[PDB]
Structure formats: C-alpha cells, structure tokens
CSV table of C-alpha atoms and ligand atoms in Angstrom, one decimal:
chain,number,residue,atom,x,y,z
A,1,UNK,CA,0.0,0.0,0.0
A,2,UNK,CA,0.7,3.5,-0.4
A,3,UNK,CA,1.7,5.8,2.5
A,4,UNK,CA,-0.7,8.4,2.8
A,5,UNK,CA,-0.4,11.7,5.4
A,6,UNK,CA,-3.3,13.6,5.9
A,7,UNK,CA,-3.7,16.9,7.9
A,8,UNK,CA,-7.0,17.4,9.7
A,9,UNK,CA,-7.7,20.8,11.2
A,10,UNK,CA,-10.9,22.6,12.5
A,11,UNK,CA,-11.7,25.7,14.4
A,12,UNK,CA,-15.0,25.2,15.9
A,13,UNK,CA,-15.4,26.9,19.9
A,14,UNK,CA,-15.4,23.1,20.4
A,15,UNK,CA,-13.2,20.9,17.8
A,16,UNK,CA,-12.5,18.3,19.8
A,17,UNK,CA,-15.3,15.9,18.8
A,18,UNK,CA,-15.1,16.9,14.7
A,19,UNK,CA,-11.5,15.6,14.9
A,20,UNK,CA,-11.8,12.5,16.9
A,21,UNK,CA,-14.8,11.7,14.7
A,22,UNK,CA,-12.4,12.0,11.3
A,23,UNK,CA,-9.1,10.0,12.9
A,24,UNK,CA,-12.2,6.9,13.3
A,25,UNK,CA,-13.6,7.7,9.5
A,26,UNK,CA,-10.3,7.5,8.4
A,27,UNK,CA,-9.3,4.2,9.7
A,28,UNK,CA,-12.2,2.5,8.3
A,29,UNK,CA,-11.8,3.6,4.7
A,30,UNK,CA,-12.0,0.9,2.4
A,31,UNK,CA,-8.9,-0.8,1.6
A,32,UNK,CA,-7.1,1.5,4.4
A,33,UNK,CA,-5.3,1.0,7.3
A,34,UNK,CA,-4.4,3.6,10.1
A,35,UNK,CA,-0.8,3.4,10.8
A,36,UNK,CA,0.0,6.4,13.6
A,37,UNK,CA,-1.2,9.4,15.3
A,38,UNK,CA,0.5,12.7,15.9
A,39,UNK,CA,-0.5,14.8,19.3
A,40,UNK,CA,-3.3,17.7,19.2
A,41,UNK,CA,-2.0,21.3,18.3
A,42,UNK,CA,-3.9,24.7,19.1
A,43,UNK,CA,-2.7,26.9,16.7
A,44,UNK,CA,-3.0,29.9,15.3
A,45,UNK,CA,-5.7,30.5,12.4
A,46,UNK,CA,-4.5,32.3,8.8
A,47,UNK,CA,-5.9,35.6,7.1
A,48,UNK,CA,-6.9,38.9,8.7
A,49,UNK,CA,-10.3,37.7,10.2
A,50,UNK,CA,-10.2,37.3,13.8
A,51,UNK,CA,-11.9,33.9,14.5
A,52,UNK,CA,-11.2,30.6,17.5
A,53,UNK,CA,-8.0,28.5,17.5
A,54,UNK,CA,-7.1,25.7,15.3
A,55,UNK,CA,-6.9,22.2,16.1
A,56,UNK,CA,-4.5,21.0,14.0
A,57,UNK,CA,-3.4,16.9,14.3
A,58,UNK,CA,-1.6,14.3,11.0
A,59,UNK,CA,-2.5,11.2,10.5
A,60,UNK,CA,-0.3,8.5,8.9
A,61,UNK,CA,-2.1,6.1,7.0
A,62,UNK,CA,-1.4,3.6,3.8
A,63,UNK,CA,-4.0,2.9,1.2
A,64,UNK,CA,-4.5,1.2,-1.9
A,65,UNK,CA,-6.9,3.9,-3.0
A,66,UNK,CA,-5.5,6.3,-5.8
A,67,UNK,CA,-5.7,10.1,-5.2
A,68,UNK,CA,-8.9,10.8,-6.6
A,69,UNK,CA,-10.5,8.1,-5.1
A,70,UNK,CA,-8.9,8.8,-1.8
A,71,UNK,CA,-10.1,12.5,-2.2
A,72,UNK,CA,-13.7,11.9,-2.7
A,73,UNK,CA,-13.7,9.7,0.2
A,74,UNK,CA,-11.8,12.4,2.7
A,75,UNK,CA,-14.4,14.8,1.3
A,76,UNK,CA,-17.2,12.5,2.0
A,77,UNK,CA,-16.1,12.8,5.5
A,78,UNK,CA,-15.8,16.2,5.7
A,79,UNK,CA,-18.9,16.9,4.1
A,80,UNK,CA,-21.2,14.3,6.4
A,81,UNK,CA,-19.1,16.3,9.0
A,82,UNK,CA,-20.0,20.0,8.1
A,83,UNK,CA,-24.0,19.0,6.5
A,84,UNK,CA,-24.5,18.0,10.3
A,85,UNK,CA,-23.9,21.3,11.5
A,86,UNK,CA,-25.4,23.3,8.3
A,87,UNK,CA,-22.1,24.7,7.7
A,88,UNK,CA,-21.4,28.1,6.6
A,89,UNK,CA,-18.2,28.4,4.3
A,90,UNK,CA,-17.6,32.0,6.3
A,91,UNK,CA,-17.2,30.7,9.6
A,92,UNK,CA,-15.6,28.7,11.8
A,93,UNK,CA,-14.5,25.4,9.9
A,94,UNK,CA,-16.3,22.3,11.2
A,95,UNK,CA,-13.4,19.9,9.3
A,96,UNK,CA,-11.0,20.3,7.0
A,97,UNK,CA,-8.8,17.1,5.5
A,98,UNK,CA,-6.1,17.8,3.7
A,99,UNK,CA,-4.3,15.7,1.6
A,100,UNK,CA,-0.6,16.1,2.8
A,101,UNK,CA,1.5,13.3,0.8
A,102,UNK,CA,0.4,10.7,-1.1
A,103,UNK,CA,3.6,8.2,-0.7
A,104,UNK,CA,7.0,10.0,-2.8
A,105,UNK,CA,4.7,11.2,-5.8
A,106,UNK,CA,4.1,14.7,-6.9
A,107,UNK,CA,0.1,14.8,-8.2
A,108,UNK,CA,-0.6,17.6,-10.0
A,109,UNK,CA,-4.7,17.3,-11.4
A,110,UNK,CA,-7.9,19.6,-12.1
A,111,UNK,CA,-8.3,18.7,-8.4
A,112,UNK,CA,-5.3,17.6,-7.0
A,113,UNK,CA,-1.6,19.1,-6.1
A,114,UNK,CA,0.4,16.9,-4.1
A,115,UNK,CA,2.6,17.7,-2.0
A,116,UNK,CA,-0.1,20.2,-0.5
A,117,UNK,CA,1.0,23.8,-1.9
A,118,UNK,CA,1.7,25.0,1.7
A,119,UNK,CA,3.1,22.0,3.6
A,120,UNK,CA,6.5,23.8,3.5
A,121,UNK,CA,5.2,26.8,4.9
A,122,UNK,CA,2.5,25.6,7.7
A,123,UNK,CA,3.8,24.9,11.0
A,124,UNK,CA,0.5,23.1,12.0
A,125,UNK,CA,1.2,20.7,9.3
A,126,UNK,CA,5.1,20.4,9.6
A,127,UNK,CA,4.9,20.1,13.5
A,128,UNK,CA,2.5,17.4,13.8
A,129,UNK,CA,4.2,15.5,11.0
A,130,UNK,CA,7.4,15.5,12.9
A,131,UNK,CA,6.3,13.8,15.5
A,132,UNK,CA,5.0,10.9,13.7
A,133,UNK,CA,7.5,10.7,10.8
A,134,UNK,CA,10.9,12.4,11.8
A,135,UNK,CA,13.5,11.1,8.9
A,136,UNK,CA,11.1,11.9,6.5
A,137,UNK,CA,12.3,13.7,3.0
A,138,UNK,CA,9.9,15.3,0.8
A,139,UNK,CA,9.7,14.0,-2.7
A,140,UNK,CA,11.4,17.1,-4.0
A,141,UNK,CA,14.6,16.1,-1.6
A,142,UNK,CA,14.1,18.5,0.8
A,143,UNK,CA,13.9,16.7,4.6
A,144,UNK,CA,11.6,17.4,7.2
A,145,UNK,CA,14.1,18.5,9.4
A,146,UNK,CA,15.5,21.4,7.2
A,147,UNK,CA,12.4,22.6,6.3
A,148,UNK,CA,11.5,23.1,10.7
A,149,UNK,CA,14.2,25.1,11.0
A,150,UNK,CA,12.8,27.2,8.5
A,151,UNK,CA,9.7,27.7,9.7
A,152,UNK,CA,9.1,28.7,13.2
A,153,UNK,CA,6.2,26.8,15.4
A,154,UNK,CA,4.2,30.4,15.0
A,155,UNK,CA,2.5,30.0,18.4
A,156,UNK,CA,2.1,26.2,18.1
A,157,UNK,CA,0.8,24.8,21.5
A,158,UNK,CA,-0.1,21.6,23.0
A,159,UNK,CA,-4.1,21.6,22.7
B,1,UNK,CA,2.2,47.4,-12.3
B,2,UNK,CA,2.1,43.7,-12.4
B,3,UNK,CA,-0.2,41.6,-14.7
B,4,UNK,CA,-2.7,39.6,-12.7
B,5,UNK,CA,-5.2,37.2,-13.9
B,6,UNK,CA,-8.0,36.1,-11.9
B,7,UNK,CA,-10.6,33.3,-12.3
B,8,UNK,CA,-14.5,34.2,-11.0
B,9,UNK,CA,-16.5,31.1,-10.7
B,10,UNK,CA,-20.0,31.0,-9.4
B,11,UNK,CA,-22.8,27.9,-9.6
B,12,UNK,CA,-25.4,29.0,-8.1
B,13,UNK,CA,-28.7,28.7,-9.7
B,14,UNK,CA,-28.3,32.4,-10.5
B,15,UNK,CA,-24.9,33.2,-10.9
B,16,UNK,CA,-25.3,35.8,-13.4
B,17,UNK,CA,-25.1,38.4,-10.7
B,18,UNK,CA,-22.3,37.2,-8.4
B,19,UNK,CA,-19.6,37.5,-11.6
B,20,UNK,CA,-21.1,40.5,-12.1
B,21,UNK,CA,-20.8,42.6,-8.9
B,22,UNK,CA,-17.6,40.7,-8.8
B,23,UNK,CA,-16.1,42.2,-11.9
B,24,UNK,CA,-17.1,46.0,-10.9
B,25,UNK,CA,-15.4,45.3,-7.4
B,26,UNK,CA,-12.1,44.2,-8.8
B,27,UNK,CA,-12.3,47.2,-10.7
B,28,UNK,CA,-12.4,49.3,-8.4
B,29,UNK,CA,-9.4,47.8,-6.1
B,30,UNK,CA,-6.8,50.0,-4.6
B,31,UNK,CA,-3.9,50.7,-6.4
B,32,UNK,CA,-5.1,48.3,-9.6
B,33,UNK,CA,-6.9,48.8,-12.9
B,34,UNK,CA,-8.9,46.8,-14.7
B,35,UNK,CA,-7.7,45.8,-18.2
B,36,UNK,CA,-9.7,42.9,-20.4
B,37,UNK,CA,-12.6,40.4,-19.4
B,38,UNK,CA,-13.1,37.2,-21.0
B,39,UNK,CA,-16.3,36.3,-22.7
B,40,UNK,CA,-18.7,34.0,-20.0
B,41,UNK,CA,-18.6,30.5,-19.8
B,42,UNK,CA,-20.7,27.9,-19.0
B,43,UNK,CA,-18.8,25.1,-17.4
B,44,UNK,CA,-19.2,21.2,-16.4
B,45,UNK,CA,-18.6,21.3,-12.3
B,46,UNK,CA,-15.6,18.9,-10.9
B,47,UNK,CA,-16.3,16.3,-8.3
B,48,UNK,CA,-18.1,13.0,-7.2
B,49,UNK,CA,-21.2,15.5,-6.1
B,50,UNK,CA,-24.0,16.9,-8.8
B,51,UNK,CA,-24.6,20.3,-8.6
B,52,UNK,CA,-25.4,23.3,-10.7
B,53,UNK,CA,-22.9,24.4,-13.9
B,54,UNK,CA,-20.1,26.9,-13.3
B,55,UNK,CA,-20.2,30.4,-14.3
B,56,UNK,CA,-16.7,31.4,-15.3
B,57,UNK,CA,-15.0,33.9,-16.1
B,58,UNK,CA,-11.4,35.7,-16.9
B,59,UNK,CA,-10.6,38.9,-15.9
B,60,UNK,CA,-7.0,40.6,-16.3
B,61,UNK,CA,-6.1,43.4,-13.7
B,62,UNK,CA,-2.9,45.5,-13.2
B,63,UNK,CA,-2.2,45.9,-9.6
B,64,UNK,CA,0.6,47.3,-7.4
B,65,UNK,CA,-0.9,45.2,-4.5
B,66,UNK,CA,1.7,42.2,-3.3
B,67,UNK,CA,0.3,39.0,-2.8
B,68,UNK,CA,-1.3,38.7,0.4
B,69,UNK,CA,-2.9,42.0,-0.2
B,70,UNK,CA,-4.6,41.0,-3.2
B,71,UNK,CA,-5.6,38.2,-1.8
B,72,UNK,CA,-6.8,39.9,1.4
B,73,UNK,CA,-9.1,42.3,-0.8
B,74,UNK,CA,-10.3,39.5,-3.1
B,75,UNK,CA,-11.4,37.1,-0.5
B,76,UNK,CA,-12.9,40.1,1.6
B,77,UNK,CA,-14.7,40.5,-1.9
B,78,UNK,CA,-15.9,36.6,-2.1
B,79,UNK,CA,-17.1,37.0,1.8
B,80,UNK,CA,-19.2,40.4,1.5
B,81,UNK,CA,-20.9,38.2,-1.7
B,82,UNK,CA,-20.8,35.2,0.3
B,83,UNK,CA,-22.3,36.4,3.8
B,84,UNK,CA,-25.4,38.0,2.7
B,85,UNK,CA,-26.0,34.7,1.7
B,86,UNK,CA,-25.5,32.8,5.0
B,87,UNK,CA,-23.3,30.7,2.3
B,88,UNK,CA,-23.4,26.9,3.1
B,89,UNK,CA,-20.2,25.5,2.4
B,90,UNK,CA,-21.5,21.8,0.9
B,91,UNK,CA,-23.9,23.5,-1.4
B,92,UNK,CA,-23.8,25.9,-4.9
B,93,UNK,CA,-20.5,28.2,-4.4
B,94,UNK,CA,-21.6,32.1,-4.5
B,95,UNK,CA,-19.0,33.7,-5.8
B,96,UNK,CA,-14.6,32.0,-6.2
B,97,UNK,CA,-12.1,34.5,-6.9
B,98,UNK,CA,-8.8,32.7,-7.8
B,99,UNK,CA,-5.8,34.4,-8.7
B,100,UNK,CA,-4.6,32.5,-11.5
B,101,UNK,CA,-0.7,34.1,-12.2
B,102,UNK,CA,0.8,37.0,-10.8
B,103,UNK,CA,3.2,38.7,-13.3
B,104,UNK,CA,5.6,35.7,-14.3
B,105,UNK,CA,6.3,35.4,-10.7
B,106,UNK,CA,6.3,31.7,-8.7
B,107,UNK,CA,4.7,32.8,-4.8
B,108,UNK,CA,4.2,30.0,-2.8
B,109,UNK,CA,3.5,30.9,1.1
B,110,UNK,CA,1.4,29.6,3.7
B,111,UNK,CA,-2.0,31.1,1.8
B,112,UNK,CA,-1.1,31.4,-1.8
B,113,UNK,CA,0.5,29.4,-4.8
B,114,UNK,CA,0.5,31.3,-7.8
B,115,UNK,CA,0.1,29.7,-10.3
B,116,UNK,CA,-3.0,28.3,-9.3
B,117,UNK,CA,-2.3,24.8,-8.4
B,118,UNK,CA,-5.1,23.3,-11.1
B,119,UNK,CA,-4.7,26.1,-13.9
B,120,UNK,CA,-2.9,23.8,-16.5
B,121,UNK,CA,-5.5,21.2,-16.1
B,122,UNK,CA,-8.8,23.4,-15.9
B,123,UNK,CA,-11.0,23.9,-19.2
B,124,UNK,CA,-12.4,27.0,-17.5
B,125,UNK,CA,-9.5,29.0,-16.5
B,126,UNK,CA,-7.1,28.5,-19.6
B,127,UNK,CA,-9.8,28.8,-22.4
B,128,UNK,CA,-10.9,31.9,-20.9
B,129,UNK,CA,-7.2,33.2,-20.4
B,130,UNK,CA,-6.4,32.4,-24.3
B,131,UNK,CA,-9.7,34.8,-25.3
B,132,UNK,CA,-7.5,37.6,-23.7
B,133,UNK,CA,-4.0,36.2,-23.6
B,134,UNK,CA,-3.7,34.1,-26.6
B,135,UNK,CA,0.3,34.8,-26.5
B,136,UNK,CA,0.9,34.4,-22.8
B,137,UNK,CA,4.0,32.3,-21.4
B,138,UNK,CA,3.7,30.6,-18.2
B,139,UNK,CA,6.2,31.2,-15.2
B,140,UNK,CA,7.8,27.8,-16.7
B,141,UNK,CA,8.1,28.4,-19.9
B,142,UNK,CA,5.1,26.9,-21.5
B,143,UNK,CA,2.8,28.9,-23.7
B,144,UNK,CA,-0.4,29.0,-23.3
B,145,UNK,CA,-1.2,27.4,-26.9
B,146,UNK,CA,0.5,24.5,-26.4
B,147,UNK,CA,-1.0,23.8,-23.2
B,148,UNK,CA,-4.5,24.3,-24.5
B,149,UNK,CA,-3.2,21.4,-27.0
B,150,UNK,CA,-3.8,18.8,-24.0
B,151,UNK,CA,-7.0,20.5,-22.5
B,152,UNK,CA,-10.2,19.5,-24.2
B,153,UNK,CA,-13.0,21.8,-23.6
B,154,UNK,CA,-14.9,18.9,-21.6
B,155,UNK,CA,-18.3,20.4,-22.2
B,156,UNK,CA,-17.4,24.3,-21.9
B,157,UNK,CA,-19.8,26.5,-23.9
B,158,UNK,CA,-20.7,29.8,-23.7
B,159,UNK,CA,-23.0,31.0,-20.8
C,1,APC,N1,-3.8,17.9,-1.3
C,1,APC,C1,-5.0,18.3,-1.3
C,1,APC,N2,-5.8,17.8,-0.3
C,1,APC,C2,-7.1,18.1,-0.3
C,1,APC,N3,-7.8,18.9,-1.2
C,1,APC,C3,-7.0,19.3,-2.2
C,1,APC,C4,-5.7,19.1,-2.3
C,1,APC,N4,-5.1,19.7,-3.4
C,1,APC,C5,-6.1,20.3,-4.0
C,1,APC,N5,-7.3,20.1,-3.2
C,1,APC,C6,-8.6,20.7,-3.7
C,1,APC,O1,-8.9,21.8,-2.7
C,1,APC,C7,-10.3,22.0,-3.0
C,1,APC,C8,-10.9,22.9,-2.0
C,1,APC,O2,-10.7,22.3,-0.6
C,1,APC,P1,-10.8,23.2,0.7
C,1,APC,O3,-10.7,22.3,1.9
C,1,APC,O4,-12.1,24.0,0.6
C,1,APC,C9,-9.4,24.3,0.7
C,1,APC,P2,-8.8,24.6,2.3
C,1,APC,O5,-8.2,23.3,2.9
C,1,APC,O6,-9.9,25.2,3.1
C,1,APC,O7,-7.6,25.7,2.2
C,1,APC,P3,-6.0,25.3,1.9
C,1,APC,O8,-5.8,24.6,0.7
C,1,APC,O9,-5.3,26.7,1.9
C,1,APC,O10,-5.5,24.5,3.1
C,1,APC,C10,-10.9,20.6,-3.0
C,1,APC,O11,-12.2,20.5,-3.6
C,1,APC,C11,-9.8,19.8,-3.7
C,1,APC,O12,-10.2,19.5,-5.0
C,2,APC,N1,-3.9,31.3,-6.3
C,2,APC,C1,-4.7,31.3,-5.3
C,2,APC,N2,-5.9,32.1,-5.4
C,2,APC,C2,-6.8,32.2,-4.4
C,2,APC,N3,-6.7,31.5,-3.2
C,2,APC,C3,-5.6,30.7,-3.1
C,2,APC,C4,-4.6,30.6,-4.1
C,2,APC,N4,-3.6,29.8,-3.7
C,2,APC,C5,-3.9,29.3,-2.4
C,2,APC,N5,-5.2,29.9,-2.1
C,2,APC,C6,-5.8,29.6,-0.8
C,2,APC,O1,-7.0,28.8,-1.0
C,2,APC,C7,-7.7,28.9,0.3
C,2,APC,C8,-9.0,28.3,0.2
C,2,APC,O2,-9.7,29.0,-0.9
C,2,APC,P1,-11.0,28.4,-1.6
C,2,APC,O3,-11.5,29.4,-2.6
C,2,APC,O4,-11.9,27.9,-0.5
C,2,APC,C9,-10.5,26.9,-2.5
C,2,APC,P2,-11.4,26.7,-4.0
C,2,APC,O5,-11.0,27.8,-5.0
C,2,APC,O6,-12.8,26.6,-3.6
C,2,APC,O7,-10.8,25.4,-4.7
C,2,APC,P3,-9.6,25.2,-5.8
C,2,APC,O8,-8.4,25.7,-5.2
C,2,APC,O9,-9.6,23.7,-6.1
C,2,APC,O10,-10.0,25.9,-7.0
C,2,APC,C10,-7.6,30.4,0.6
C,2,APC,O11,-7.9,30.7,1.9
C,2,APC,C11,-6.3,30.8,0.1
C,2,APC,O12,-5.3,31.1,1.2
C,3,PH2,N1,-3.8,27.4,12.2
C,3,PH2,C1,-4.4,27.2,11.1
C,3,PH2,N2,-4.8,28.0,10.2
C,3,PH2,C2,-5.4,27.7,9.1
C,3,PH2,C3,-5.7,26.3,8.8
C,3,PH2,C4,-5.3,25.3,9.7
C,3,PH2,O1,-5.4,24.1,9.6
C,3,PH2,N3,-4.7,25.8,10.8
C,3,PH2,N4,-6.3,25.9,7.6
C,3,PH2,C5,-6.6,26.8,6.7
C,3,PH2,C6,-7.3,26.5,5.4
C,3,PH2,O2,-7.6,25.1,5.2
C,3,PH2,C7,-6.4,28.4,7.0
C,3,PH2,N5,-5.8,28.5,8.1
C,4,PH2,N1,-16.6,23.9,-13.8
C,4,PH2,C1,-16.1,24.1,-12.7
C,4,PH2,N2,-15.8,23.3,-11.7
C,4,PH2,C2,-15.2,23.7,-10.6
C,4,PH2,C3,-14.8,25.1,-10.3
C,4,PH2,C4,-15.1,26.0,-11.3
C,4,PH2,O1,-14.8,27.2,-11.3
C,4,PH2,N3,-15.7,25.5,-12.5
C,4,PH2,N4,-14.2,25.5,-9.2
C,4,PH2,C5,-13.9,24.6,-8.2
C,4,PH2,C6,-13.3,25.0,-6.9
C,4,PH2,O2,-13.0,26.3,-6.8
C,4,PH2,C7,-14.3,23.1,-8.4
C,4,PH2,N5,-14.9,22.9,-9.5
C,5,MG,MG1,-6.6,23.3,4.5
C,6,MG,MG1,-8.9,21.3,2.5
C,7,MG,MG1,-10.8,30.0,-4.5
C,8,MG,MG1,-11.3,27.7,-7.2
C-alpha cells in the first residue's frame, strides 16, 4: 500500500469531537489502514479575520486507494461532517482534510496538487508530521528536518 | 504594475449576478486597474457531487498590491458576496475568486500558490485566459497554446 499523510484541522469553539470523529472515518476507509497518530495542536488561524483557535493533528495512513478516489472519500467525511452542522463556508471550519503526501509522488490534477502547496510553509502541518515521521524527505529532496528550521512553530501549542 | 489574472467562478442557480458585482469590485481595487474580461462561460462542475454548472469567467487586472494583499481584498470580496448569503459551504458556491498568475512570478507561502495549483489542467481557467491572452507564457516556460493542446473543452460552452 501507499503511505498516505493527511492533515485534519478545525476551528469550531469546540473541535474536539469533529476531529476524533475523522481519525475513526479514516481508519475505516476501504482498503485502508491507520498506521499512527500525531499529538493535538492549538494553533493559530490564517488571514486577517479574527476567528477561534485551530486544532491541527496528522494522520499516517497507507491505502491502496488512488488520489482521486482517496479525495472523494476524505471529502465525504468532511462533508457528512459540516452537512451535520449546516455549515457556513464564512465561519468557523467544522473539518477540514487535507491531503498532505500521497507516498513520494508529486500529483498535479484539475483537483489535486500533491505535496499540499503549503506543507512547507505551515507549522501546524510540519509540526504534527514530525512527531509521527521524523526522517522523512519530501519528494522534492528537501527533509523534514531542514524545512522546521525554517519555519518557526508560530505560536504552536499543546491543545 | 504587475499583470494579474483572476478566475470568477460562481454555480449558483443564479450566478449571473455574483460574476457581475464581482467584476465592478475588482475594478475598483486599490492601487489596480482593470484591463480585459473574457467572454462568460458555461462550465461542467468537478467532483463526485451533482450540482449546478459553473459560471466562469477571466478577468486581467494590473495591480501594485503584493500577494497577500490581493488576496486579502479579493477574498474580503468573495465574503461580502458570500455572507449576505449565509453561504453553506457543501452546497452551490456564491461567488470564487482565484488568482490564476501573478506577473511571471512563482509565490508560494502559507496562503497562496500562484500559479494556481489546477490552472494547467482546468478547461475554465485557460480557455478563458487564451480569449485575452492568446500569447501568454507561463512562469515555466510553456505557452499557453501548447497547453491548451492537451485541455479539451470537456463540455465548456458559452453562458
Ligand atoms: N492535497 C489536497 N488535499 C485536499 N484537497 C485538495 C488538495 N489539493 C487540491 N485540493 C482541492 O482543494 C479544494 C478545496 O478544498 P478546501 O478544503 O475547501 C481548501 P482549504 O483546505 O480550506 O484551504 P488550503 O488549501 O489553503 O489549506 C478541493 O475541492 C480539492 O479538489
Ligand atoms: N492562487 C490562489 N488564489 C486564491 N486562493 C488561493 C490561491 N492559492 C492558495 N489559495 C488559498 O486557498 C484557500 C481556500 O480558498 P477556496 O476558494 O476555498 C479553494 P477553491 O478555490 O474553492 O478550490 P480550488 O483551489 O480547487 O479551485 C484560501 O484561503 C487561500 O489562502
Ligand atoms: N492554524 C491554522 N490555520 C489555518 C488552517 C489550519 O489548519 N490551521 N487551515 C486553513 C485552510 O484550510 C487556513 N488557516
Ligand atoms: N466547472 C467548474 N468546476 C469547478 C470550479 C469551477 O470554477 N468551475 N471550481 C472549483 C473549486 O474552486 C471546483 N470545480
Ligand atoms: Mg486546508
Ligand atoms: Mg482542505
Ligand atoms: Mg478559491
Ligand atoms: Mg477555485
């Protein structure tokens, strides 16, 4: 199978429950398995607006599921997720699923870009995915490790 | 000032006036002149889930804005379009403004990725950037034409 890291973030008053409820869609999605969890991060939203506190956490994974199909499914769950609460896309987010890696591949489709455009960049994505996957080296060479001395943990905190 | 091109998408069952208002409100950003709009387009929508067509549209802007605060006043722009709406985020989109290329510059940060991620790839951004940029030459060195060589219209008409 593939090895598959995906971010999951939300910024509901209480996003606790919207997270735990992904990590358990994502282990039971078809031909899946769940491989390791990183620790919960309160971190500090992007843009101008003033809104709550992310909860930012990576799964590992590893699939047999190609990106597409792996993306409707993450969707699905983040859909089923935000339908519940009637969610408004100005406002907090109920649960978002990024795609971070999809094993050493660069995808690049009408829907897709792989490595996630700011992986690099985002301490609540870089962060978590230390924990869980230390020696890891982008597919563009780059390692983990260089990159988190780049960027800084921006007010990353233990949730 | 720097060449910008940005891609207004709307599917709402009424999208007519979202592109619109849309249009007069990048033309009247700070610091930035409008400079060519692409004919309208009715487009096929991308994902699993059926939903209404696209409404899209090219428009080409100079701007002395950076990044981020472009991107500040467009999304300000999607959200004052968006929140009158009480905009659910699983249902028809109101109004997306993304920036497609920003001079021939390469800006990848925690928010943006310029180009757009999917612009190579998406019927509905580079037909409508060939109507007023039939010479253009991506970032990478790839013209426009050749690109649109490998894009098939996949069911793109005129609104
Ligand atoms: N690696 C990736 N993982 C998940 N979705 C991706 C993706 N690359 C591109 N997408 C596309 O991103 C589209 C919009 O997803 P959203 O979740 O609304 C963006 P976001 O996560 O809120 O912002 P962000 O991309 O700045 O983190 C999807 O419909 C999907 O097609
Ligand atoms: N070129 C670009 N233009 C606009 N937003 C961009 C962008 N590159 C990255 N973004 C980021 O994309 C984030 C989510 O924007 P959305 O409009 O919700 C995604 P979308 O346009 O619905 O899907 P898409 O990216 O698949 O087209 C923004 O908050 C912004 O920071
Ligand atoms: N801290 C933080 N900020 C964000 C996040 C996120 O997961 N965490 N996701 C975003 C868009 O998906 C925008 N901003
Ligand atoms: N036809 C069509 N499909 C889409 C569009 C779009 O503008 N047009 N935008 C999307 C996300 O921003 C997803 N899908
Ligand atoms: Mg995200
Ligand atoms: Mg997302
Ligand atoms: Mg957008
Ligand atoms: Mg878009």
């Amino acid at each position: 199978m593939i090895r598959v890291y995906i971010a999951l973030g939300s910024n509901l008053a209480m996003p606790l429950q919207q997270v735990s409820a992904a990590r358990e869609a994502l282990a039971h999605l078809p031909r899946s398995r769940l491989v390791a969890c990183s620790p919960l991060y309160r971190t500090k939203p992007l843009g101008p607006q003033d809104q709550p506190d992310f909860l930012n956490a990576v799964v590992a994974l590893d699939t047999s599921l190609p990106p597409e199909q792996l993306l409707d499914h993450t969707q699905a769950i983040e859909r089923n997720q935000g339908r519940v609460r009637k969610e408004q896309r100005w406002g907090p987010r109920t649960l978002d699923l990024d795609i971070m890696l999809y094993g050493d591949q660069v995808i690049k489709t009408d829907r897709l870009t792989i490595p996630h455009y700011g992986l690099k960049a985002r301490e609540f994505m870089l962060y978590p995915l230390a924990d869980i996957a230390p020696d890891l080296i982008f597919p563009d060479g780059e390692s983990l490790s260089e990159c988190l001395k780049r960027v800084d943990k921006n007010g990353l905190v233990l949730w």
